Amino acid sequence: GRDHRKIGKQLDLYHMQEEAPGMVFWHNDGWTIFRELEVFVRSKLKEYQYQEVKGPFMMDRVLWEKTGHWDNYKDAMFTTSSENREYCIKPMNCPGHVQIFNQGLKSYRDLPLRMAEFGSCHRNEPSGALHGLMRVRGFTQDDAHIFCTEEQIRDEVNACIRMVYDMYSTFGFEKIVVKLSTRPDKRIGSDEMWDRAEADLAVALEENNIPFEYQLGEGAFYGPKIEFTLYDCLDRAWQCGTVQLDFSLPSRLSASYVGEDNERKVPVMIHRAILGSMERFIGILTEEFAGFFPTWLAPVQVVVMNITDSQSEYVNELTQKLQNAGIRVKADLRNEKIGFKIREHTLRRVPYMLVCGDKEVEAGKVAVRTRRGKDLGSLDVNDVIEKLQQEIRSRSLQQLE
Amino acid sequence: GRDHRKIGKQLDLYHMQEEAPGMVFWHNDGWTIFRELEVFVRSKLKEYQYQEVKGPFMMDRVLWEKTGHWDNYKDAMFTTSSENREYCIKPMNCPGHVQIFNQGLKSYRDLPLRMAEFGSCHRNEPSGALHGLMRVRGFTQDDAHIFCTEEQIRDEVNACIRMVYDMYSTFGFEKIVVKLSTRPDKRIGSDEMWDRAEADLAVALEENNIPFEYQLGEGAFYGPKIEFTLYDCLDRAWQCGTVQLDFSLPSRLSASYVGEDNERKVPVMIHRAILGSMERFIGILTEEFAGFFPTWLAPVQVVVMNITDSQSEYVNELTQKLQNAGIRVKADLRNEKIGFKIREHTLRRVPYMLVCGDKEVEAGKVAVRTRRGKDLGSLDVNDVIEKLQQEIRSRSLQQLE
Numbered sequence: 001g002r003d004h005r006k007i008g009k010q011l012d013l014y015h016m017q018e019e020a021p022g023m024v025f026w027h028n029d030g031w032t033i034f035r036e037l038e039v040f041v042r043s044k045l046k047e048y049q050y051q052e053v054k055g056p057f058m059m060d061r062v063l064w065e066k067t068g069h070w071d072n073y074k075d076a077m078f079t080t081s082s083e084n085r086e087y088c089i090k091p092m093n094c095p096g097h098v099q100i101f102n103q104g105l106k107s108y109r110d111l112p113l114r115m116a117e118f119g120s121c122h123r124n125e126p127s128g129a130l131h132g133l134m135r136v137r138g139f140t141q142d143d144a145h146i147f148c149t150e151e152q153i154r155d156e157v158n159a160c161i162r163m164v165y166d167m168y169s170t171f172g173f174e175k176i177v178v179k180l181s182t183r184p185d186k187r188i189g190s191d192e193m194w195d196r197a198e199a200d201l202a203v204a205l206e207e208n209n210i211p212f213e214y215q216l217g218e219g220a221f222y223g224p225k226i227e228f229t230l231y232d233c234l235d236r237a238w239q240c241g242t243v244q245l246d247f248s249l250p251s252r253l254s255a256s257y258v259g260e261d262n263e264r265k266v267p268v269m270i271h272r273a274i275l276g277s278m279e280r281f282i283g284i285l286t287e288e289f290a291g292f293f294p295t296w297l298a299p300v301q302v303v304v305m306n307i308t309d310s311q312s313e314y315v316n317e318l319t320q321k322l323q324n325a326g327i328r329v330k331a332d333l334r335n336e337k338i339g340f341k342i343r344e345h346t347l348r349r350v351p352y353m354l355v356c357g358d359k360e361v362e363a364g365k366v367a368v369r370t371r372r373g374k375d376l377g378s379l380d381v382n383d384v385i386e387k388l389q390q391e392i393r394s395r396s397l398q399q400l401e
Numbered sequence: 402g403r404d405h406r407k408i409g410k411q412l413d414l415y416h417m418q419e420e421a422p423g424m425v426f427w428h429n430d431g432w433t434i435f436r437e438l439e440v441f442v443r444s445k446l447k448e449y450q451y452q453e454v455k456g457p458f459m460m461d462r463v464l465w466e467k468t469g470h471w472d473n474y475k476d477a478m479f480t481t482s483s484e485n486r487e488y489c490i491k492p493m494n495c496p497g498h499v500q501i502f503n504q505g506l507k508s509y510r511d512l513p514l515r516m517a518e519f520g521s522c523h524r525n526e527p528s529g530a531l532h533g534l535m536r537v538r539g540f541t542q543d544d545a546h547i548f549c550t551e552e553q554i555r556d557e558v559n560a561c562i563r564m565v566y567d568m569y570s571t572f573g574f575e576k577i578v579v580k581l582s583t584r585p586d587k588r589i590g591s592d593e594m595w596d597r598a599e600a601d602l603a604v605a606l607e608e609n610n611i612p613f614e615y616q617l618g619e620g621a622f623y624g625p626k627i628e629f630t631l632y633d634c635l636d637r638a639w640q641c642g643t644v645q646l647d648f649s650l651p652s653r654l655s656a657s658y659v660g661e662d663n664e665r666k667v668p669v670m671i672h673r674a675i676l677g678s679m680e681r682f683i684g685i686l687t688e689e690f691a692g693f694f695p696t697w698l699a700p701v702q703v704v705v706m707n708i709t710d711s712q713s714e715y716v717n718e719l720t721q722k723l724q725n726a727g728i729r730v731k732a733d734l735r736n737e738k739i740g741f742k743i744r745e746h747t748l749r750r751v752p753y754m755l756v757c758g759d760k761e762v763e764a765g766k767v768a769v770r771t772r773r774g775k776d777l778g779s780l781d782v783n784d785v786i787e788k789l790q791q792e793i794r795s796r797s798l799q800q801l802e
């Protein structure tokens with residue numbers, strides 16, 4: 001009883017309909033979760049020293065032919081036309097990132113250049129294969145590309161791996177299985193490029209004490225991949241993360257920089273995504289938590305409620321203070337029994353229920369109950385606000401005990 | 402200068418390519434401005450009680466055919482096909498918002514329902530008419546649709562008008578022309594509906610003490626509208642804001658709610674955008690400010706710089722303090738003359754240059770230079786940080802004096 005489709009309906013997070021197969025409509029509360037997940041990713045982009053960009057939604061087929069995506073992916077790409085030119089709605093963000101890199105002369109002092117995007121991508125998947133948020137047609141990839149020198153590969157691949165485990169640990173995912181996918185039958189780049197790339201990814205895994213198995217022939221057409229699979233609380237495997245080494249795309253798109261030796265050089269490209277897609281990861285989280293999202297992700301974090309209208313002015317004031325502390329809060333001043341109110345907000349998976357009777361109004365206190373049924377007692381309002389702020393800002397998995 | 406296309410190149414904000422006509426490649430610094438503009442709009446969504454949602458990029462042509470917009474605008478829509486079905490890449494967000502409205506039984510108690518989206522839209526505009534950020538194919542509107550009763554229209558229009566002036570004032574736009582477009586020759590609804598609807602728009606304007614003029618017969622087939630034209634510092638007119646009444650779309654897309662008398666009732670829709678295209682608005686702002694973006698919008702708010710090698714670690718400490726204070730800060734530790742650093746960052750329109758010589762280090766102070774060439778002298782570090790935070794939080798047009 002943790003279906004993301006059911007929870008998504010019950011908590012008014014999102015919906016899907018037949019007029020847009022495999023594409024999500026995010027309702028207010030679901031979009032709040034999505035945006036908080038974006039805020040989290042951005043905090044990591046800042047920490048790990050990434051730029052953030054935005055590329056065009058479509059680009060001319062001629063460009064996708066040049067990069068190799070047309071030859072490999074044409075049947076799974078959406079196309080559209082204008083003025084006798086054909087455009088592919090983008091399946092990937094990498095070519096756009098190279099286009100941005102190519103604006104303005106680059107040198108070795110600009111490298112490593114780490115370029116991230118919340119990339120809106122589309123895949124023309126067979127419609128019968130779509131399911132929930134887990135297999136979709138339109139998605140938002142937490143993508144980035146690192147442009148670096150050959151000598152910087154080791155440190156930059158190492159940083160990507162650190163970033164992967166760091167981010168998964170935030171959500172409580174500690175059981176991770178790793179595969180290394182090597183040269184596929186249909187590919188671009190020379191065998192010596194592939195020897196180098198496969199070797200570098202293998203060394204990274206050895207050095208980080210990450211056990212792995214090879215997945216022979218399952219690499220991307222443009223480079224080998226480290227694939228990260230996390231396991232949820234039901235012990236189900238979800239492949240989410242990927243780190244790839246690419247010596248082909250930057251050459252094909254005429255990317256270059258001036259090295260230390262003043263010689264014109266082609267940058268190496270590292271591709272990576274960690275969550276995989278915002279939509280699928282939200283799906284996974286919804287099931288992992290069964291809708292009991294950690295406080296930092298919860299659509300509504302606190303509900304403050306009165307017993308009678310005698311405490312209404314105090315509740316409104318307290319609601320305002322919580323909102324000023326950055327907390328997603330609402331007041332429940334209805335003329336309903338306290339057990340009726342508490343149940344409604346517990347059903348809605350609100351982390352904290354703040355109750356104000358006469359005794360609380362008199363003492364400048366608030367009675368705190370958690371959605372798990374724990375009565376924390378009557379506590380000083382400022383102590384409660386501070387404790388909630390820390391729980392939220394630290395992105396704690398745990399509520400107050 | 403005040404050419405946003407030249408400034409856009411100079412400050413590394415964005416670029417365009419023929420591979421994606423009229424679709425912007427946002428570089429890090431331009432995307433920072435875009436993201437800050439979103440944050441600003443979201444603060445107003447909160448203040449004016451809007452939900453925020455997100456819809457997919459495409460929906461079945463079959464659904465678009467039902468809206469009453471198909472015959473009018475089929476030539477300007479991008480289409481793409483899959484499995485014998487044709488999809489439209491959305492040029493507007495209204496039908497998607499109605500799809501969200503149509504999920505779950507709605508009651509009169511849910512009205513007015515205010516639904517905003519930063520809606521990623523595409524129009525197949527002729528390539529010859531494209532121009533920088535102002536005339537594009539891919540654009541993002543600060544869009545919203547309000548679903549309400551007939552009796553609620555005036556108050557809801559009143560709030561939209563307040564929102565327009567509130568938002569324009571933030572950017573220094575106080576000269577605003579207002580036009581009310583009245584019933585066209587070809588229209589839906591009775592004459593009485595139009596009498597009431599035109600009167601609601603006029604009364605809402607009167608209630609905000611706003612003089613206006615008519616654009617006779619220029620209303621849409623589905624209702625009258627108000628349009629807001631702001632004037633920049635060169636006295637150039639930019640039509641940006643729209644409040645559009647719509648008595649057609651809800652019925653066309655089977656939208657309804659349970660009235661207080663238990664009757665199935667069709668809501669009225671209000672379409673509204675304040676900035677309009679955010680790409681275009683960024684273009685307007687770029688020219689308005691001549692690239693001197695107010696500090697809250699500036700891609701890089703502060704550069705901290707040393708005179709000689711001796712102050713490098715003080716610069717690092719101060720940069721970290723600014724980082725921790727939420728300021729977009731960079732350290733310039735190059736072995737270059739201080740005047741060279743000031744010239745470069747002045748040219749890049751960085752609001753503040755925080756200069757650290759021995760005297761500053763020794764006193765725990767910093768010397769503050771503005772991009773206007775103003776020497777503000779030696780100031781206490783914590784005081785400067787507090788003043789910068791206040792300038793940013795208040796979204797002030799004015800730098801410290």
Ligand SMILES: C[C@@H](O)[C@H](N)C(=O)OCCCCCn1cnc2cc(Br)c(Cl)cc2c1=O
Pocket residue numbers: 073076077090091092093094121122123124143144220225242271272273
């Ligand atoms: C991490 C990113 O930078 C990287 N480009 C990426 O997407 O890699 C994901 C794993 C390797 C690549 C695996 N794959 C393969 N065929 C595809 C065809 C289409 Br059409 C689309 Cl939309 C996506 C893919 C895809 O993802």
Ligand SMILES: C[C@@H](O)[C@H](N)C(=O)OCCCCCn1cnc2cc(Br)c(Cl)cc2c1=O
Pocket residue numbers: 470474475477478492493494495524525544545546643672673674
């Ligand atoms: C404010 C928004 O909700 C509103 N829908 C909107 O876009 O308003 C902007 C101004 C008036 C919008 C009026 N118009 C203008 N150009 C269009 C181009 C295409 Br292609 C299509 Cl399908 C429809 C329209 C359209 O209806």
Ligand SMILES: [Zn+2]
Pocket residue numbers: 092093094145271272
């Ligand atoms: Zn990639």
Ligand SMILES: [Zn+2]
Pocket residue numbers: 493494495546672673
């Ligand atoms: Zn609309």
